[PDB]
Design a binder for this molecule. Structure first.
Ligand SMILES: CC(C)c1nc(CN(C)C(=O)N[C@H](C(=O)N[C@@H](Cc2ccccc2)C[C@H](O)[C@H](Cc2ccccc2)NC(=O)OCc2cncs2)C(C)C)cs1
Ligand code: HEM
Length: 457
């Protein structure tokens, strides 16, 4: 296996027996991707254990695997460990299975359904400002992840299940406590390092009922979803939950739970993380924060409530969101398994190979971005906008397998940002880590929580 890239004429770091190039992930795989792009150029290959991983950076080639040949050859993501029943979760499912889950869940975020959620989200936006104002009162340092996380949990559960768990008023909320423990992918943990280097273990762990997701956490989610499912079949809004309930009358019970777990995690974890990164960038760039507040005041004079339409009018807010996602992409890498031998744009790719798009590296690539390490919202303005390649910058992925919650995530975060900024200003304090350093974990997260001071306007 370790002689594949050598044989095909593809550059790459020399692999070690059994480990492949996995030890290079000691200072984060993003740095590894950066160094490989600089050292080897437009394409290179490395090995995760025995698994060949081909990294591509050419726009047209990226478009070919993410869009053109999605259903035909690059249909699924890389298997990543024992998943138990979560094998049915849409993001983990493959081929035809994934195809039906996709069409089934697709109606969830139509433009019409998104608009209906605005007032629902607003209730939580109001509680968010209230909680933050308390922090502004005491003047104590604020851990963004907690407050923004509770807001995110409340929003995803209400809009998806029509149930208000009121996380914004219950700090030890079991939903957040459990969800934040759902997946702690860490290469320093022997379990995750082992299954990544030796995939043959996966089948064995599945028999043993050993899962990457803690049994205690999934049990909790399973019970929680059942409860909410009941409250709906017993009471006298077509939402995520309804869509799945309707299918049952070919979706099985655990299967419905599997999708629910994906939505809860994405709505809570992924959303609150990006909000934290955005507020960090705003606190360390007062001119950007000041300028953003002015746009909001101009569009919504005297703290007027935001609306679906006015959210879309805010050009700078959108430039700020996009720029933060460029520097801190939750998708540090995008991947597709090559499920059959094929050539694309002049390059041959053997079956079984994992094709990887080093997003984090491409976003900081000194060919497409001047001053790549700088937070400059202007690069996304109408003027410079069209000069950004649609396949170099894909924070939500692209093609048939892209983020199904993209429009909801952008709308929800923007609603939060608006309410918060039309009431407060965030400033860095003593507990604020600057520069901000990312953890080496599998998911996009800073090493120490982002802490900031909130001041009332
Ligand atoms: C060595 C290798 C295995 C590793 N790769 C990475 C980066 N890459 C490329 C990944 O595909 N990492 C994977 C991942 O994020 N997979 C994903 C889609 C994706 C791809 C790239 C960037 C962001 C989202 C999806 C995985 O099926 C998971 C599994 C899961 C279920 C419940 C709670 C947490 C996780 N599904 C979700 O996390 O959906 C949540 C979300 C929805 N939108 C953004 S995240 C895994 C490790 C789970 C980190 S470690
Ligand atoms: C700012 C927040 C978010 C970001 C940055 C984001 C980003 C991504 C990315 C990069 C992928 C991988 C796509 C690919 O491989 O091409 C993904 C997949 C997915 N996301 Fe998100 N996401 C976010 C929020 C959400 C939310 C809130 C939901 C749902 C409510 C959601 C549901 C999904 C699903 C189900 C998938 C898998 C799609 C499939 O396999 O068909 N995401 N997301």
């Amino acid at each position: 296996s370790h002689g594949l890239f050598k044989k095909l004429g593809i550059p790459g770091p020399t692999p070690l027996p059994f480990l492949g190039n996995i030890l290079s992930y000691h200072k984060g795989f993003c740095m590894f991707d950066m160094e490989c792009h600089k050292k080897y150029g437009k394409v290179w290959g490395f090995y995760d254990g025995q698994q060949p991983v081909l990294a591509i950076t050419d726009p047209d080639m990226i478009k070919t695997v993410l869009v053109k040949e999605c259903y035909s050859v690059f249909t699924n993501r890389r298997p990543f460990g024992p998943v138990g029943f979560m094998k049915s979760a849409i993001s983990i499912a493959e081929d035809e299975e994934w195809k039906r889950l996709r069409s089934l869940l697709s109606p969830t975020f139509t433009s019409g359904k998104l608009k209906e959620m605005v007032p629902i989200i607003a209730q939580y936006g109001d509680v968010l400002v209230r909680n933050l104002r308390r922090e502004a009162e005491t003047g104590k340092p604020v851990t963004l992840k907690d407050v923004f996380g509770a807001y995110s949990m409340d929003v995803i559960t209400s809009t998806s299940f029509g149930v208000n768990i009121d996380s914004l008023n219950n700090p030890q909320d079991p939903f957040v406590e459990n969800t934040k423990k759902l997946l702690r992918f860490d290469f320093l943990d022997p379990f995750f390092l082992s299954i990544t280097v030796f995939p043959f273990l996966i089948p064995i762990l599945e028999v043993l009922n050993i899962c990457v997701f803690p049994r205690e956490v999934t049990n909790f989610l399973r019970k929680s979803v059942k409860r909410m499912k009941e409250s709906r079949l017993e009471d006298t809004r077509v939402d995520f939950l309804q869509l799945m309930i309707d299918s049952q009358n070919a979706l099985s019970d655990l299967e419905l739970v599997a999708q629910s777990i994906i939505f809860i995690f994405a709505g809570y974890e992924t959303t609150s993380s990006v909000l934290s990164f955005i507020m960090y960038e705003l606190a360390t760039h007062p001119d950007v924060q000041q300028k953003l507040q002015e746009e909001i005041d101009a569009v919504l004079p005297n703290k007027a409530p935001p609306t679906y339409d006015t959210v879309l009018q805010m050009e700078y807010l959108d430039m700020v969101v996009n720029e933060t996602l460029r520097l801190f992409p939750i998708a540090m890498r995008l991947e597709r398994v090559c499920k059959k031998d094929v050539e694309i744009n002049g390059m041959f790719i053997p079956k079984g190979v994992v094709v990887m798009i080093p997003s984090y590296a491409l976003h900081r690539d000194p060919k497409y971005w001047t001053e790549p390490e700088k937070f400059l919202p202007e690069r996304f303005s109408k003027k410079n906008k069209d000069n950004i390649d649609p396949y170099i910058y894909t924070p939500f992925g692209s093609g048939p397998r892209n983020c199904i919650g993209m429009r909801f995530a952008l709308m929800n975060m923007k609603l939060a940002l608006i309410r918060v900024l039309q009431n407060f200003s965030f400033k860095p304090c003593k507990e604020t880590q600057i520069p901000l350093k990312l953890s080496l974990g599998g998911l996009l997260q800073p090493e120490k929580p982002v802490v900031l001071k909130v001041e009332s306007r």
